[PDB]
Amino acid sequence: AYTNSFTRGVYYPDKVFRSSVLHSTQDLFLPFFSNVTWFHAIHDNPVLPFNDGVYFASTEKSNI
Amino acid sequence: LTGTGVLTESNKKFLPFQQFGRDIADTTDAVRDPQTLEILDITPCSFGGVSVITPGTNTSNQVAVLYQDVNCTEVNVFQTRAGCLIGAEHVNNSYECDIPIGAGICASYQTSQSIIAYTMSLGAENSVAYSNNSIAIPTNFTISVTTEILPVSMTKTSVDCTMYICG
Amino acid sequence: YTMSLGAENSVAYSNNSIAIPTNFTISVTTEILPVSMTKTSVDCTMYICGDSTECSNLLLQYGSFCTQLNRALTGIAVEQDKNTQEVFAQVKQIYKTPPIKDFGGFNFSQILPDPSKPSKRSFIEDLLFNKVTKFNGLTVLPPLLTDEMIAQYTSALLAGTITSGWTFGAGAALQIPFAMQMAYRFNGIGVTQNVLYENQKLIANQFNSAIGKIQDSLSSTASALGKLQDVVNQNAQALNTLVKQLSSNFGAISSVLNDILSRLDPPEAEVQIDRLITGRLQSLQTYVTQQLIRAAEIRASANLAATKMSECVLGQSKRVDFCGKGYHLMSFPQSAPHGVVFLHVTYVPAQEKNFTTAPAICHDGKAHFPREGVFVSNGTHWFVTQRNFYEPQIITTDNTFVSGNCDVVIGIVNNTVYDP
Amino acid sequence: SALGKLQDVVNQNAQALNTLVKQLSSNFGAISSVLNDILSRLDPPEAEVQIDRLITGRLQSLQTYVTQQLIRAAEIRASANLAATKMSECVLGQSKRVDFCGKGYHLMSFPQSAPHGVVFLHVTYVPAQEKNFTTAPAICHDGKAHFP
Amino acid sequence: TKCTLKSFTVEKGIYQTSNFRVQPTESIVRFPNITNLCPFGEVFNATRF
Ligand SMILES: *[C@@H]1O[C@H](CO)[C@@H](O[C@@H]2O[C@H](CO)[C@@H](O)[C@H](O)[C@H]2NC(C)=O)[C@H](O)[C@H]1NC(C)=O
Ligand SMILES: *[C@@H]1O[C@H](CO)[C@@H](O[C@@H]2O[C@H](CO)[C@@H](O)[C@H](O)[C@H]2NC(C)=O)[C@H](O)[C@H]1NC(C)=O
Ligand SMILES: *[C@@H]1O[C@H](CO)[C@@H](O[C@@H]2O[C@H](CO)[C@@H](O)[C@H](O)[C@H]2NC(C)=O)[C@H](O)[C@H]1NC(C)=O
Ligand SMILES: *[C@@H]1O[C@H](CO)[C@@H](O[C@@H]2O[C@H](CO)[C@@H](O)[C@H](O)[C@H]2NC(C)=O)[C@H](O)[C@H]1NC(C)=O
Ligand SMILES: *[C@@H]1O[C@H](CO)[C@@H](O[C@@H]2O[C@H](CO)[C@@H](O)[C@H](O)[C@H]2NC(C)=O)[C@H](O)[C@H]1NC(C)=O
Ligand SMILES: *[C@@H]1O[C@H](CO)[C@@H](O)[C@H](O)[C@H]1NC(C)=O
Ligand SMILES: *[C@@H]1O[C@H](CO)[C@@H](O)[C@H](O)[C@H]1NC(C)=O
Ligand SMILES: *[C@@H]1O[C@H](CO)[C@@H](O)[C@H](O)[C@H]1NC(C)=O
Ligand SMILES: *[C@@H]1O[C@H](CO)[C@@H](O)[C@H](O)[C@H]1NC(C)=O
Ligand SMILES: *[C@@H]1O[C@H](CO)[C@@H](O)[C@H](O)[C@H]1NC(C)=O
Ligand SMILES: *[C@@H]1O[C@H](CO)[C@@H](O)[C@H](O)[C@H]1NC(C)=O
Ligand SMILES: *[C@@H]1O[C@H](CO)[C@@H](O)[C@H](O)[C@H]1NC(C)=O
Ligand SMILES: *[C@@H]1O[C@H](CO)[C@@H](O)[C@H](O)[C@H]1NC(C)=O
Numbered sequence: 001a002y003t004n005s006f007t008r009g010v011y012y013p014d015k016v017f018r019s020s021v022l023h024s025t026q027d028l029f030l031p032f033f034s035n036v037t038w039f040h041a042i043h044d045n046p047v048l049p050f051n052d053g054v055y056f057a058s059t060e061k062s063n064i
Numbered sequence: 065l066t067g068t069g070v071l072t073e074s075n076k077k078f079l080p081f082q083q084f085g086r087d088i089a090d091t092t093d094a095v096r097d098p099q100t101l102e103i104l105d106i107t108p109c110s111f112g113g114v115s116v117i118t119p120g121t122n123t124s125n126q127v128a129v130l131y132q133d134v135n136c137t138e139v140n141v142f143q144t145r146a147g148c149l150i151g152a153e154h155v156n157n158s159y160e161c162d163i164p165i166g167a168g169i170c171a172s173y174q175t176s177q178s179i180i181a182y183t184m185s186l187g188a189e190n191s192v193a194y195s196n197n198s199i200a201i202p203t204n205f206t207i208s209v210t211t212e213i214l215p216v217s218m219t220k221t222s223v224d225c226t227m228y229i230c231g
Numbered sequence: 232y233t234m235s236l237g238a239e240n241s242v243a244y245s246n247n248s249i250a251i252p253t254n255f256t257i258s259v260t261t262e263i264l265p266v267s268m269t270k271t272s273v274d275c276t277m278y279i280c281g282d283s284t285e286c287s288n289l290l291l292q293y294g295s296f297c298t299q300l301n302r303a304l305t306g307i308a309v310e311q312d313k314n315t316q317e318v319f320a321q322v323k324q325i326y327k328t329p330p331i332k333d334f335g336g337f338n339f340s341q342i343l344p345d346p347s348k349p350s351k352r353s354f355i356e357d358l359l360f361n362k363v364t365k366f367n368g369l370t371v372l373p374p375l376l377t378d379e380m381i382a383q384y385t386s387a388l389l390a391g392t393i394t395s396g397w398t399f400g401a402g403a404a405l406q407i408p409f410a411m412q413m414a415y416r417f418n419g420i421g422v423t424q425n426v427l428y429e430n431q432k433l434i435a436n437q438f439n440s441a442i443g444k445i446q447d448s449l450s451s452t453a454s455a456l457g458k459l460q461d462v463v464n465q466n467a468q469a470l471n472t473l474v475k476q477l478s479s480n481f482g483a484i485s486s487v488l489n490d491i492l493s494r495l496d497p498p499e500a501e502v503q504i505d506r507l508i509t510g511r512l513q514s515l516q517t518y519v520t521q522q523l524i525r526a527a528e529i530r531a532s533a534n535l536a537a538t539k540m541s542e543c544v545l546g547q548s549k550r551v552d553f554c555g556k557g558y559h560l561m562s563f564p565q566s567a568p569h570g571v572v573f574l575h576v577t578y579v580p581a582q583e584k585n586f587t588t589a590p591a592i593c594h595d596g597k598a599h600f601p602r603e604g605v606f607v608s609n610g611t612h613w614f615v616t617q618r619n620f621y622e623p624q625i626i627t628t629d630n631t632f633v634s635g636n637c638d639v640v641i642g643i644v645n646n647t648v649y650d651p
Numbered sequence: 652s653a654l655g656k657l658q659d660v661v662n663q664n665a666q667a668l669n670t671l672v673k674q675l676s677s678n679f680g681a682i683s684s685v686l687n688d689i690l691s692r693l694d695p696p697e698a699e700v701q702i703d704r705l706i707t708g709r710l711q712s713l714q715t716y717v718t719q720q721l722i723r724a725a726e727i728r729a730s731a732n733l734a735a736t737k738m739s740e741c742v743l744g745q746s747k748r749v750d751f752c753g754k755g756y757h758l759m760s761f762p763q764s765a766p767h768g769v770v771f772l773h774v775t776y777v778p779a780q781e782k783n784f785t786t787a788p789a790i791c792h793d794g795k796a797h798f799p
Numbered sequence: 800t801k802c803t804l805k806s807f808t809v810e811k812g813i814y815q816t817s818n819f820r821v822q823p824t825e826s827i828v829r830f831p832n833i834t835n836l837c838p839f840g841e842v843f844n845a846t847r848f
Contacts, residue, residue: 017078017085017094066489068282068823089365089474098831108366109821111277116800120811127800131819133370138821146373163813164312167373168380171813186380187387190324192394192404196333199786200398200405202778210753212771213656214734218727219664219767221720223671229709231686274818293708294677295670299715305815321750401755402777410788425798428788505680516715523722531729538751546749 001038005030009055030055067092067106074105110138117152117163119173128152128179130165142181144169152181160185246642249588249605252580253621255422257434259441260555261448262573263458264536266318267374268529269466269569270308271522273473274368275300279511281367283488285497286504296512300519307526312375314533318571319376319384319564321540326390326404335410336435339393341442342563342574344386352382355565355572358449362456363463363568365474381566388544388564400545413560419547420558420578421619438576445574459570465525473518481510536571540564543573558619584621589613589644592626598640599631599648613646625649657768663723671716679708734769738762741771 009030036055037048041064048054065084076085078096085094085103094105113132128151131139136148143149146166161184162172171181193200243250275297280286290297328343344351352360360378376384395404396412410431414424427434449455480486483503484495491503543554543562554562557577565572586607591598604617606626614623615630624630627649637643678684681701682693689701741752741760752760755775763770789796800809803816 015083017082111820114817168377194329194394200781204780206779210773215730215768292678541750
């Protein structure tokens, strides 16, 4: 299964405070609208590659 | 992280994970004190330039000193928007600009004599006696001759690049 | 798509047809010129070797490379004030309008100083200032003439133009009723002054409407000040690039000089410092060269602005399209951030008719030519009228002159010439 | 001070040449500014490096000089074009352009030569004395409006 | 000024002769108060070896 990553996967590249500024930086980011594999936990915990870094997200209602 | 500057209190709301701030030029703007979680601004220590305002040495050896873009703190002291001017007397009377300082302030050597600083005039005020039925028509005239000097040419220099570099 | 270049419009040319305007419109156009640029100053020693004795000692081996950049920047800073002085300080006295604005119906309240403001600028000037918007040894010097003083110079020039026409430029300001000043302005473009006097109310209303349109344009069109915003942006970009260049390594192990000095012994630190000095000196030389070229462009613009001020505001321009499209009457200066704005008042023909014409009229065998104007026919009767405004008059010996005879002039027509 | 516009050009060119010549005394990182002292003391493997450093410094100095001369030459060219325009429209003719040929109403001009420049003597008509008169745009006679 | 212009006569005007720069008076060294100590006590002052 795949879903749309939309605009998720952006993190603060460093610990520098900036305001009212557009800052251009090159780092390991999740490409926008890329495909991320969708796993389910109903009614599935495989081992995945790590490559050069992994973005992880989950949705919860009972802290599974 | 090291540097030189003046540390002052600030009202910048740093986020708990942010430790340093930067300006548009990528220089350090502020830091969070690692012992007490307050934000301190970093203002580089005052710097600028020293200008000497003087009448020609054929008249007097008295000079005035302008410290550009500084306050009259770190340095007969007159604070102007051009910097801190020391040695020139501030005179309320305006005159034609003589030795320009900047930001509307000029200095000159006048009256016992000393260097003074003042806001320049720009000329005498002269209202025109305008009305809807009055015309001024010249009755006499003067023929004047003025001199306008323009550069036309410059010295035709020539440099032997090989002999200059590797003589 | 392939661009057009405009509508196609053939002219109804023929050997005996002339179009002469019967009505006119007074238009006001806005011309914005840069006059000055930010008087930047860079401390080459502090920029290259900030608070570093070793770097300064290595820099001293390059001789005058450092101080000649300070010299070039000083020259630029000085010529920026020379440019401002040459553009605005063209009037020997500070003139002011009378308290009673009895200018023949012409409303100047939107270009004259507003006494209620903290700085006596006009409404339009206030609109202009509201549209146009480090510590590494880079400083900015203030201008010699403050915005208030520039506004005072433009006020003096405007009051002179309004109350004395062009007379204040040549010598003393000689008061003249504004309507008569406009009568001279009309005569200067080949339109007889009675056209002004008979249409004084219409002309004043057209002028006031054109000024209102200028106000709406400046209040609504942000792009109007692009010529000045581009200069401000170029100078800000040059300074931001110069400062950003300090973060470059230029081949060194680190862009931070203190990190090199604290980690390497002199035999290697001196090499890394020489690399940083070379990179930063090249950056300064590039900046200074770009500033000299931009300063030359600004100087050319300031010289053009001063020429326009002298031959447009202080006088009346016969130069086509020098002071806006149309036949130039008068111009009014307005100040702007690092520049000057000219409001050009021009006479533009508005409505025209197709008339039949002739180069000359025969009476008793004599060839009569107009003293001023041209001969026109409405299809039954021949008249003489001024070339720039239809105003038919009976053809008389006081309108025409005799030269030669009917057998020489090509296209001469038969009519009668009235003898008063 | 009347000839400052020409003296400043002469001074700028003299200063540029003095700076260019003085740049030969700089080391630019070399052990010595004198090339013969490097050649007489170091073997080729080191002399070539010291020479490359001096060549880089002196070539950069020449490039700076030439760029400054090109900019100054462009300024002088603009001034010369203005002077030629004034000559044609001021000396050879009569100028209707306000303040192009001096303050006042231009009558005639006379050229004079000067070192590396031209001097114009502008003859202008300037009103000297004035009176306050009452005026009117037109006069009625028999109901007709008369204009001058 | 005389040295800047390389002359013993100075014409009327304003000349830039030297750059002013405030010097620092003292250094400031900052590190957090108590990060984390190391249990060297239980190694040296161990009850039994
Ligand atoms: C117009 O002005 C000129 C000078 O600008 C006057 O000539 C002067 O007249 C006075 C007499 O009051 C003599 O004393 C001067 O020596 C004259 N000077 C020159 C240079 O000629 C002339 O008289 C004036 N004309 C009128 C009608 O007032
Ligand atoms: C010349 O043009 C002006 C406008 O450019 C005319 O003035 C207008 O006249 C109409 C009457 O048909 C009025 O409704 C408008 O309000 C007028 N406008 C202004 C600004 O006055 C003028 O009438 C024209 N003259 C001739 C002879 O046609
Ligand atoms: C000149 O124009 C200004 C506006 O451009 C006029 O000022 C207006 O006057 C009316 C009353 O007649 C007020 O209601 C407006 O609020 C005013 N506007 C501004 C911006 O001041 C002024 O009256 C005109 N004067 C003449 C003689 O026509
Ligand atoms: C061309 O102009 C002439 C001169 O005005 C016109 O002749 C007049 O016409 C009016 C009517 O419009 C009569 O009341 C006058 O008595 C005429 N005067 C003369 C001397 O003939 C003529 O009508 C105009 N032609 C056109 C086509 O408009
Ligand atoms: C204009 O009028 C003149 C006379 O005033 C005309 O000249 C006549 O031309 C014809 C043709 O050659 C001759 O036969 C007549 O003898 C000429 N008249 C005289 C008095 O000699 C001329 O042709 C007229 N032109 C037009 C275009 O009507
Ligand atoms: C990702 O998957 C979606 C459908 O699940 C597809 O439309 C999209 O093109 C895929 N992305 C790429 C880069 O192929
Ligand atoms: C001194 O030199 C200046 C030149 O700027 C000149 O104006 C002034 O008259 C001179 N004074 C004396 C006493 O020579
Ligand atoms: C200069 O310092 C005084 C007090 O030390 C302060 O009131 C003033 O605003 C300062 N001026 C500037 C331009 O910093
Ligand atoms: C100028 O006049 C004001 C009063 O308007 C006064 O307060 C000020 O001190 C005067 N300036 C000097 C230098 O005395
Ligand atoms: C004159 O006649 C031509 C005929 O083609 C016409 O196009 C033109 O509009 C006419 N002029 C006016 C003012 O109407
Ligand atoms: C104008 O040209 C036409 C031909 O197009 C000719 O018949 C007529 O006579 C000419 N008129 C004049 C005055 O030249
Ligand atoms: C005209 O009258 C005004 C009144 O204020 C006066 O100032 C002016 O000098 C007079 N003109 C002449 C030429 O005297
Ligand atoms: C460090 O100093 C702050 C400021 O007083 C204090 O609140 C904090 O408790 C100190 N750290 C520890 C571990 O006590």
